[PDB]
């Protein structure tokens, strides 16, 4: 037979990546970070809160403005945030109640989300008669979608729990490209600061990078123990965070090719929702199902603070262009601005 | 100038405000129920009781409004998309009477995951038809799937139809029991178990369903009072 | 990476006993519950037998109550699952599978036909 030969021939080649990854550990990420001094006591304090949704939310996303954000809930409503002044400016009926993820484009002038009903509705903000109404519907994956990001206002890239991603053309309406290659539901994905890459975290327990332009996978990252929920870009995009249910975050490198840091503690032992890194990428805020978001040092790997105001399960984090708040979305249908 | 601003957006979130009234009313004015079937199960035909990636079925039952979600086109994989549904009213489970090993291992881990521990299941055992006659035929015995059925006994809340054999009503009661042994081993008040033996044939299906949704949300309203 | 590499098998006579092992890398095997399952000819994915973290909630299937038994090591992370009066009804290729998430009670998934967290199989033919 030829299946157990290229069975044996993958360990070989996995063998072959192993020992060359090995070859680049000169100095723990901690030993280099060891002389340091700490970040000291982040002392963040709920300065917004949100109460609109009706039921649980499962995901935000900030707009780049920093002020606007829109977030989704499963009572089948998508609702736009003026944080600043928390008047809610937009309220968008779905056709169907389950959303997983939701979208808010660069520009300003889309919003998307999908979920149970395996389509990515497209929502022009800025219409002829001043109303919201379903600009374009992505149809064509098999699984539930669990992530979607935009590239422009006619480029979006989508996760979906048929273990594929895919980049769309919003104008066509059809899929431009699939990334296969993950053995389970991609949950969580993350665009870097240029649009040419982009890594997403499945259930298989790794983390794969992929070209846009070629549609390509380029690098797979292992080292978490379950599924991954959350992945987050460092500012510069030479690294990347993940979140997964193994009770720990732990840091990769682009061009190391292997991790550098993990971020776990004995009395955690519920898995991470989200993730996402501050302005200068020191302060790693990791989302968790405790109802509490801890604050972990990206260099030295100690916890520096905890966001503790959400009764329910902390489904969301994200921090602004600007970096100057947090907002995080909970099943408490309530949504918390941190500063 | 600023303040026009400022109060546009003071009397638009108001505008929305009232509409999320309104949605508020119909939102708690119903109940979601999932339906989770298996391979040939026949659930199929409880929809039809009165592509995609999930169906809809509304009905009115004594002017309550339900609504069922049926699954589509979603992968075997269930432990991400069940999180979904843990706030419906009850998850409606059908079985058909080791595929029957499976159904039990389905609705183990529905019963006891960390985000459905406060949600009601209502079983529906479905085919009592086919049940009914391998077992008076004896060609395949179940025995050989579940040996325990051997020192089994028909239980004291048995109510045989009229016209049912003394051997199918030992068959049908053991397999509820089998559901009802995983229910009883993890229930601490926060959600229980509706068995019911239904067929192709039943007509009274919804009126199950309503009638045990009752006791869902009575029983919901005496823990809030801390009655029950 | 998490890697599990089932080990033992082969045919075997009717009546006869195999000893099937698991080797486990890539995370702590304490902290989860490992799974027995197996694919017969023909036939879908049937899960056999599972085991908690710590070794004491132990439950089998039907079909092979009282005949297999499944242990664990974990201070050597390994899954053990001792077959003893093998039917020739019990030739399926076994998989040595964990439950998605640590120190969780429910185990979803173990019996898909796509699932990360299980090895590739060890083949047990039961003939003469």
């Known amino acids: 037979s030829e299946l157990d030969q290229l069975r044996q021939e993958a360990e070989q080649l996995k063998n072959q990546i192993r020992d060359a990854r090995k070859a680049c550990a000169d100095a723990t990420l901690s030993q280099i970070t060891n002389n340091i001094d700490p970040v000291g006591r982040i002392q963040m304090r709920t300065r917004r809160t949100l109460r609109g949704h009706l039921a649980k939310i499962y995901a935000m996303h900030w707009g780049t403005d920093s002020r606007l954000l829109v977030s989704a809930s499963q009572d089948g409503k998508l609702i736009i945030w003026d944080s600043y002044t928390t008047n809610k400016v937009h309220a968008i009926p779905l056709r169907s109640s389950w959303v997983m993820t939701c979208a808010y484009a660069p520009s300003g002038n889309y919003v998307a989300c999908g979920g149970l009903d395996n389509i990515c509705s497209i929502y022009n903000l800025k219409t002829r008669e001043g109303n919201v109404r379903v600009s374009r519907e992505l149809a064509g994956h098999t699984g539930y979608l669990s992530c979607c990001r935009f590239l422009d206002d006619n480029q979006i890239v989508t996760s979906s729990g048929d273990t594929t991603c895919a980049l769309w053309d919003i104008e066509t309406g059809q899929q431009t490209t699939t990334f296969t290659g993950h053995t389970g539901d991609v949950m969580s994905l993350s665009l870097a600061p240029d649009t040419r890459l982009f890594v997403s975290g499945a259930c298989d327990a790794s983390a794969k990078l992929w070209d846009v332009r070629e549609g390509m996978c380029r690098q797979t990252f292992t080292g978490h123990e379950s599924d991954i929920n959350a992945i987050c870009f460092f500012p510069n995009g030479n690294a990347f965070a993940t979140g997964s249910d193994d009770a720990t975050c732990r840091l990769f490198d682009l061009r190391a090719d292997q991790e550098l840091m993990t971020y776990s503690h004995d009395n955690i032992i519920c898995g991470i929702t989200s993730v996402s890194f501050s302005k200068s990428g020191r302060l790693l805020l990791a989302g968790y199902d405790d109802f509490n978001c801890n604050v972990w040092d990206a260099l030295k790997a100690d916890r520096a603070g905890v966001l503790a105001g959400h009764d329910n399960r902390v489904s969301c984090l994200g921090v602004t262009d600007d970096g100057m708040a947090v907002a995080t979305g909970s099943w408490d249908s309530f949504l918390k601005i941190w500063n | 100038d600023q303040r026009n601003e400022e109060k546009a957006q003071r009397e638009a979130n108001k505008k929305i405000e009232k509409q999320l009234q309104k949605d508020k009313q119909v939102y708690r004015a119903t109940h979601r129920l999932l339906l989770l079937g298996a391979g040939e199960s026949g659930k199929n035909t409880i929809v039809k009781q009165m592509t995609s990636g999930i169906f809809e079925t509304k009905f009115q039952v004594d002017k309550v409004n339900f609504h069922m979600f049926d699954v589509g086109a979603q992968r075997d994989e269930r432990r991400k998309w069940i999180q979904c549904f843990n706030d419906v009213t009850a998850i409606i489970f059908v079985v058909a009477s080791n595929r029957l090993q499976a159904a039990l291992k389905l609705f183990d881990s529905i019963w006891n995951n960390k985000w459905l521990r406060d949600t009601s299941v209502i079983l529906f055992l479905n085919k009592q038809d086919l049940l009914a006659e391998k077992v008076l035929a004896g060609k395949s015995k179940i025995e050989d799937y579940f040996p325990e059925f051997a020192r089994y006994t028909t239980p004291e809340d048995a109510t045989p139809e009229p016209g049912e054999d003394p051997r199918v009503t030992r068959a049908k009661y053991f397999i509820r029991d089998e559901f009802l042994r995983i229910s009883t081993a993890s229930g601490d008040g926060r959600h229980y178990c509706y068995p019911h033996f239904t067929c192709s044939v039943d007509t009274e299906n919804i009126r199950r369903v309503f009638n045990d949704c009752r006791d869902i949300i009575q029983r919901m309203h005496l823990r809030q009072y801390e009655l029950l | 990476q998490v890697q599990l590499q089932e080990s033992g098998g082969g045919l075997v006579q009717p009546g006869g006993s195999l000893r099937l092992s698991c080797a486990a890398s890539?995370?702590?095997?304490?902290?989860?519950?490992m799974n027995w399952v197996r694919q017969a000819p023909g036939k879908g994915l049937e899960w056999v037998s599972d085991?908690?973290?710590?070794?004491?909630?132990?439950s089998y299937t039907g079909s092979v109550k009282g005949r297999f038994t499944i242990s664990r090591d974990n201070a050597k992370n390994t899954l053990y699952l001792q077959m003893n009066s093998l039917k020739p009804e019990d030739t399926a290729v076994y998989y040595c599978?964990?439950?998605?998430?640590?120190?969780?009670?429910?185990?979803?998934?173990?019996?898909?036909?796509?699932?990360?967290?299980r090895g590739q199989g060890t083949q047990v033919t039961v003939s003469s």
């Open positions: 599978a964990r439950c998605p998430a640590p120190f969780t009670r429910d185990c979803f998934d173990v019996t898909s036909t796509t699932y990360a967290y």
């Open positions: 085991i908690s973290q710590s070794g004491a909630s132990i």
């Open positions: 890539g995370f702590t095997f304490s902290n989860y519950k």
